[PDB]
Amino acid sequence: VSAKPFMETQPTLDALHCDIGNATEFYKIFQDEIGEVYQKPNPSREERRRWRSTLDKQLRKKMKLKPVMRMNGNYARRLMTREAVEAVCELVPSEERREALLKLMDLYLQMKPVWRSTCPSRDCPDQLCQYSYNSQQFADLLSSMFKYRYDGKITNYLHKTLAHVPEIVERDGSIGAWASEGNESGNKLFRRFRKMNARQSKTFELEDILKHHWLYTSKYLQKFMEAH
Amino acid sequence: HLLSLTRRAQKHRLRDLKNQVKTFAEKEEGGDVKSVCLTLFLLALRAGNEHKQADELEAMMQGRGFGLHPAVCLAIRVNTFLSCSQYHKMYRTVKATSGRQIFQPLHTLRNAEKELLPGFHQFEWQPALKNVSTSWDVGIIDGLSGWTVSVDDVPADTISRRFRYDVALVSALKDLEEDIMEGLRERALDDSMCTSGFTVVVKESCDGMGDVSEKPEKAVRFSFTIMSISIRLEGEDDGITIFQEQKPNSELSCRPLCLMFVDESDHETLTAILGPVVAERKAMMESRLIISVGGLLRSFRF
Amino acid sequence: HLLSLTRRAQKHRLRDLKNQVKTFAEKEEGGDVKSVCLTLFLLALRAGNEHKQADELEAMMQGRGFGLHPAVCLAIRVNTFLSCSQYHKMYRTVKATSGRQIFQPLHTLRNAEKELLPGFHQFEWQPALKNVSTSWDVGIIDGLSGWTVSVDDVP
């Protein structure tokens, strides 16, 4: 703590992304399972790149997932599936860590929609109840099998999704129900509202922009735009 | 052809079935020839897939409005991004075509709209707020918020506009009064005994927004949304959800309250503008609001 | 009361009289039950003295009885630069709002418009023109005018 805060923020998880760090770390894990980190703990500049290439075209063969740069939504969704995990199992030389990471991604699927929910107290209370021991086994496996990497370094996303999620849902009642995403959606309004209904002098421009935006976002005027 | 004849010839040739319908209706439906022939022609059209003609006929009888409510008129001006001069030209056209004032003209549309923005729905506060004027009819406040133009100091250049928090809140709540009254209908709770304990949960959001692209680069959009309303009467009542919002992420319900042409990064100007809203929200969580909804004045916490 | 009933119920209650009208139409007007009951309604209204409604009804049958000529509808799409999905949303609105079909829908709009573009109306030419095609239906011709795309020449 080094700066005088002035904005009371409920320090909540952002349900929107909430996943991309987990997915890119599963990517690095699978790339280090094509490689051997716990046999070759000092890979060179290009072993990793060849491993990424064979993994990527391997997925291209089975799951038909062309290479990417960054984990957007749909790519991330398709990457975390039992079938893609058994697909990468084809290439890993040993078969013990095969079943290890299989159970890993299994528990991952079991605990995933717990955070993207709207009210798991009624949508999926089973996954909430099992979540404690679920994430516990998750951490246990990540330590016993993968501690070649998580000795000192962790991505923030991992910590937030492993530590407090059930406590968060208990304290508030949901996770998705406060996603900032909504307001970010609203951006495509503002900019375009600038274009067609300008005034247009900056002393006045905001007046009309705000007027019209508010007009848009009222229950009253939508309740007439029923179209059953 | 029968429809090519005169009234005399049609009468002469159809008096037979006229008397048949007469005796049938007097037997069953009290002789109401009007409603009988109406329903008969309707069913005759519906068998021929003529939904359009039958629908317009039923629009001729009970009811026969021709009047478009100025509320929907405004919505359709805005909800589909029609510009204003556009709207006036199209109105002149739809009038000059067919004989009816189907789209209420511009100025009355604006007047009808004016009742919906902030600064029209009176209210009181117990107690009066901290360091806030009791004025309640002030509309769009210039966001600069009284900045001495003297260029000796930090520039007063930054452009921004915003409402007042409380006025926007009373606007949104008088907007949703319909749904809260419907929830009191469903929940079947008392009415003369549900006027004190309302709990409104509100979610804020302030995100950066870059580069409006045109031929004025950065911007912030400080917006909030009603999230849930519950009751506090009368025992422990751990939770009595009057209404939980259904699409809290759908942008269709996320209303803006402040906007500035500042950078997301620099702490200085962002604070210098947002300060007012901070002080409001802080001094707000304590006192309680009194609003006239459904004829009854009722109290609200936050 | 007959009016507030359902279509099933109204059909059930009126079936007998409807068969009487059906056989009457077969015997006299060849099953044109539609025009027969229409004339019944017209004269029953003109007996009721609300002749405004009788004139409107006659304006419906054989008139432009869909509310508004689709031609002016297309003009108001274009003559104020309105977009297309724009138009459909607006149409949804006006339809659901007040009980009537005022704005003609999309596909009928386009099909009714298609006559106005060039290349629709058969004609003839005396004499036939010099080195000009014989067709008259072709619409928007690509202005390239058939260039051999071969990148050896000017492209």
Ligand SMILES: [Ca+2]
């Ligand atoms: Ca951002």
Ligand SMILES: [Ca+2]
């Ligand atoms: Ca952003």
